[PDB]
């Protein structure tokens, strides 16, 4: 049995003065997650490009918690549909970063990707990155994953560029609001909103204000 | 460069002066044919250097100009740097080759409009409000020529002044121009009349465009 005591007002309320209905409760999902003792505790995915975006490097930094041992490995594999386009395997132990050494509980994998399909609002090309924590001899401990979009965002010479080209933001601010359910969001409502936005030539959304 | 007395009168009465080298090669095709040619660098240099040597002590002179309508050539870049080296006290401007070249401290277009772009190939005349904020652009903008006062004209003059007052980096301009270049001719009765291009048997000519 769980017991949750939810307070409508707290010191946090001073930082939550958005122009919206003031409601309260357990208004998003509740879940139970099982992780192994030796686990992926964090991972970051970055994509860097050459000048014309014909070559990319996917860099995945992976952190573990738990029992750190020499047999441990991380494999990051990159998929385009059913095709594996890239893969890298390494033991834990990052590069030396200061006088005390490095992160023995971290590893950075670097994957070369030739002619990556690029992500934009126009063509949302995605790859799948699978992060496998495993023993060297082939025992999967656990896997985590994410959708990867190969894109660079940078400001250069006063312009916001996406994959080297200046964006024109056709945006809208969107609160999480339902006339019956209040601030509870469901998949159906989210999809309905996205379809209507795209059908009306929007390409961008601001999470006003959270 | 003007008659020497002009600068003394501007010193004393109080007018800001742009002193401009006697270099215009407008009729060349393309406009920079001579100004990009190193064989014409000596001749151009004398028109710039001898102006600076003569007029550099006049307080009324606040800006040096490399000339007018001669495109943009390497000779301009060389002479821009010569002036900057010998006289750091005054900005150098030049409109040729698109009004915002490496040979000018001031974006100095001629007849760029307030709100309307004129996107000519190679040498566009942007809206002056737009021009200021082009990616990477930081310089002030002062039109070397605007509001062409030919005949019944100066329509839209107020639009320029509204923009000049609203935008810090729009710092005004020079109207084209002060005085009609008409000449006096005499009829059979000896009565004077105002003449323009073609009235002296001059051909080819550009008729009333001198006024
Ligand atoms: Mg507010
Ligand atoms: Na101004
Ligand atoms: Na004229």
UniProtKB/Swiss-Prot annotation, chain B:
Similarity comment: family membership: Belongs to the glycosyl hydrolase 2 family.
List of residues binding Mg(2+) 1: 24, 26, 69
Protein name stated in the entry: Beta-galactosidase
Binding site for substrate: 69, 145-148
Binding site for Mg(2+) 2: 205
Annotated binding of Na(+), by residue: 209
Induction summary: By allolactose.
């Amino acid at each position: 049995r769980l017991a949750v005591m939810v307070l409508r007002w707290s010191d946090g309320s001073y930082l939550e003065d958005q122009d919206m209905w003031r409601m309260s409760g357990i208004f998003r999902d509740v879940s139970l997650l099982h992780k192994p003792t030796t686990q992926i505790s964090d991972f970051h995915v970055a994509t860097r490009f050459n000048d014309d975006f014909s070559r990319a490097v996917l860099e995945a930094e992976v952190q573990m918690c738990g029992e750190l041992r020499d047999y441990l490995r991380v494999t990051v594999s990159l998929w385009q549909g059913e095709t594996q386009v890239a893969s890298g395997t390494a033991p834990f132990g990052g590069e030396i970063i200061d006088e005390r050494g490095g992160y023995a509980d971290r590893v950075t994998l670097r994957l070369n990707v030739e002619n990556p399909k690029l992500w934009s609002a126009e063509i949302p090309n995605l790859y799948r990155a699978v992060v496998e924590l495993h023993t060297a001899d082939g025992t999967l401990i656990e896997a985590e994953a994410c959708d990867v979009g190969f894109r660079e965002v940078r400001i250069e010479n006063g312009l916001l560029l996406l994959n080297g080209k200046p964006l024109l933001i056709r945006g809208v601010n969107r609160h999480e609001h339902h006339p019956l359910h209040g601030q509870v969001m469901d998949e159906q409502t989210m999809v309905q909103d996205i379809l209507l936005m795209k059908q009306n030539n929007f390409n961008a959304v601001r999470c006003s204000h959270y | 460069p003007n008659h020497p007395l002009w600068y003394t009168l501007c010193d004393r009465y109080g007018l800001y002066v742009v002193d401009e080298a006697n270099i215009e090669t407008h009729g060349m095709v393309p406009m920079n044919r001579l100004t990009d040619d190193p064989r014409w660098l000596p001749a151009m240099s004398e028109r710039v250097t001898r102006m600076v040597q003569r007029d550099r002590n006049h307080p009324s002179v606040i800006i040096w100009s490399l000339g007018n309508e001669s495109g943009h050539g390497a000779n301009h870049d060389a002479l821009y740097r010569w002036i900057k080296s010998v006289d750091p006290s005054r900005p150098v401007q030049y409109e040729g080759g698109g009004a915002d070249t490496t040979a000018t401290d001031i974006i100095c277009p001629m007849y760029a409009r307030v709100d309307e772009d004129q996107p000519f190939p190679a040498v566009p005349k942007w809206s002056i409000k737009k021009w200021l904020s082009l990616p990477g652009e930081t310089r002030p903008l002062i039109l070397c020529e605007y509001a062409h006062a030919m005949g019944n004209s100066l329509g839209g003059f107020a639009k320029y002044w509204q923009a000049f007052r609203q935008y810090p980096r729009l710092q005004g301009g020079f109207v084209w121009d002060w005085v009609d270049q008409s000449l006096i001719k005499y009829d059979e009765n000896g009565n004077p009349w105002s003449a323009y291009g073609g009235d002296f048997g001059d051909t080819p000519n550009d008729r009333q465009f001198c006024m």
